C-alpha cells in the first residue's frame, strides 16, 4: 500500500506515495506451499538503503552489518541478502503464500490505449451535450474545427490552459468545444407599490438561446416594449 514501510515495502517492492491503481491478492497455499517448505520463493532481507517506488533489485552480493569489512562470502557481521519463505502447508494463515497482482495505472496524457467495455454513440454537432472522448468528459457545444492540429496532436487548449478542441477517436476530424451558454438573470420592475409588471434581462445572452423580445447589447431583454 502507498506510504507503508517494513522489509517488503523497504527492500523488495515500493508503491509511490500517490499510487493510482488497485492491489489484488489471494491465498495460494495449494499452488505454492510444499510438504517440506517451498524454497522457490525468497525475499530480500537486507539493503544499504530503502528502494525507490517501482525500483527492482536482483543484487545477490553480501551485505555488511557492522563497522569492520567483509571482503569475502561469509562472516559474523555480514550475510547473503535473500532469505527463503518456509511455505509448508502446516503453516497457519498469515504464514501461507499469497499471490499478489498490483494493477498500476497512468491516466490521459497521450490518448488512452486501455479503456473499459463501453460502446460509442453517434456524434451530434451545434447542440449543447455532455461528451466523453477517450475518458475526457465534459459538457459543451461541438463544432467542426478550422484549427490546424499536427498529425500527432489529440487535444487543443486556450490561453487559460483549458480544452477548446478535440479529435474524435473514430473519425480523426477536429471539433471546436464551446461552453454551453450562461448569464445573470435580472428582473426589472417599477416596484410593487406601482405595479406587479416586470421585464427580464438575460445578460450577455443572444435571444435565440432563451411577449416582447429585444436584443440589447446588455443581453436579451424580454417583456419590455422597445
Amino acid at each position, epitope marked *: 500500500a502507498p506510504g507503508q514501510t517494513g522489509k517488503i515495502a523497504d527492500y523488495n517492492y515500493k508503491l509511490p506515495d500517490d499510487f493510482t491503481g488497485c492491489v489484488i491478492a489471494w491465498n495460494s497455499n*495449494n499452488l505454492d*506451499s510444499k*510438504v*517440506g*517448505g517451498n524454497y522457490n520463493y525468497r525475499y530480500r532481507l537486507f539493503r544499504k538503503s530503502n528502494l525507490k517506488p517501482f525500483e527492482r533489485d536482483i543484487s545477490t552480493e553480501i551485505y555488511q552489518a557492522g563497522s569492520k569489512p567483509c571482503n569475502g562470502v561469509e562472516g559474523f557481521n555480514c550475510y547473503f541478502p535473500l532469505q527463503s519463505y518456509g511455505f509448508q*502447508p502446516t503453516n497457519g494463515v498469515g504464514y501461507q503464500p499469497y499471490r499478489v497482482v498490483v494493477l498500476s495505472f497512468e491516466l490521459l496524457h497521450a490518448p488512452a490505449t486501455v479503456c473499459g467495455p463501453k460502446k460509442s454513440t453517434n456524434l451530434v454537432k451545434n447542440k449543447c451535450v455532455n461528451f466523453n472522448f477517450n475518458g475526457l468528459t465534459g459538457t459543451g457545444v461541438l463544432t467542426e474545427s478550422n484549427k490546424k492540429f499536427l498529425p500527432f496532436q489529440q487535444f487543443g487548449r486556450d490561453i487559460a490552459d483549458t480544452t477548446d478542441a478535440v479529435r474524435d477517436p473514430q473519425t480523426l476530424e477536429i471539433l471546436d468545444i464551446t461552453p454551453c451558454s450562461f448569464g445573470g438573470v435580472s428582473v426589472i420592475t417599477p416596484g410593487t407599490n406601482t405595479s406587479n409588471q416586470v421585464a427580464v434581462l438575460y445578460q450577455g445572452v443572444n435571444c435565440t438561446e432563451v411577449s416582447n423580445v429585444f436584443q440589447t447589447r446588455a443581453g436579451c431583454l424580454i417583456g419590455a416594449e422597445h
Partner: antibody
Amino acid sequence: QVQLVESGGGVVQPGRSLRLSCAASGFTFSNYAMYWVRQAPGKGLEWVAVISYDGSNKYYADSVKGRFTISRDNSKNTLYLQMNSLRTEDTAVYYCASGSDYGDYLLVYWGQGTLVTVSS
Amino acid sequence: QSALTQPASVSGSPGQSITISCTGTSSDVGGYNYVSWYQQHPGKAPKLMIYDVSKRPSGVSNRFSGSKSGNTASLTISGLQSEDEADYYCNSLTSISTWVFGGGTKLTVLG
C-alpha cells in the same frame, strides 16, 4: 493422462530387505511431494512415508521410522521405498501416490498397488 | 499414527441421501481445512472424491459433498447409486506433519 506404475513387491523372509519402485509420467514429478501408503489384506489404509519435491525432506510413520528409507530420482521420474528389517506386519499392498495443484499435501494420483508378503 | 474414527459401515436405498462421519483432534481435523475423502472400490487403488473439507476434483459427481464442525468431518452422498458401493476413507494432515487415515466405512447400497 497421469500414470504411476509400480514394481518390486513379492514374497520375502522376516528380518530381510526389499526395494519398491514407482515410475511416474504425465506430470512434472519433481514439482510434487510423493507418498507411500499401504493396506494389509482386508484392512484400511496406513500412511507409510512422504518425500519432498526436491527430496530434501522426508517423513515416516512410527511403524516404519528407523527402518524404511524413501528416495527419488527427479531425472528418471522414479520414486523408491527401501524397506529394511521387514516384519510380518509389513505384509500389505503398497501404493505410491502424489500431490498436484489441488494441494501438494493431497494424495491426488495413485499407482496400481504392489503386494509385499513378509512370511517365514 | 492414531487413526481418525469412522463408522464401520452405512447403508441406504438408491435415490436416498446418506452421510459418513469422520472424527479427529485439534491437531488434525479441528486444526486444518484439509480433510480429504477417498473412495476405494474392491480390489483396486483409492481415488480422491473430496478435499480441503468440501472441494471436488474435476470429473467427480456433484452427488458427493463434504463438511466439518469442531473435531468432526462429514461426507454426504445424495441420490445413492450402485457405483457408490465402496470403502470410503477420511484422511487429514496433522500439526506433527504426519498423515492420518480413518478406519474406513463400507457403503452397502440396498440394490
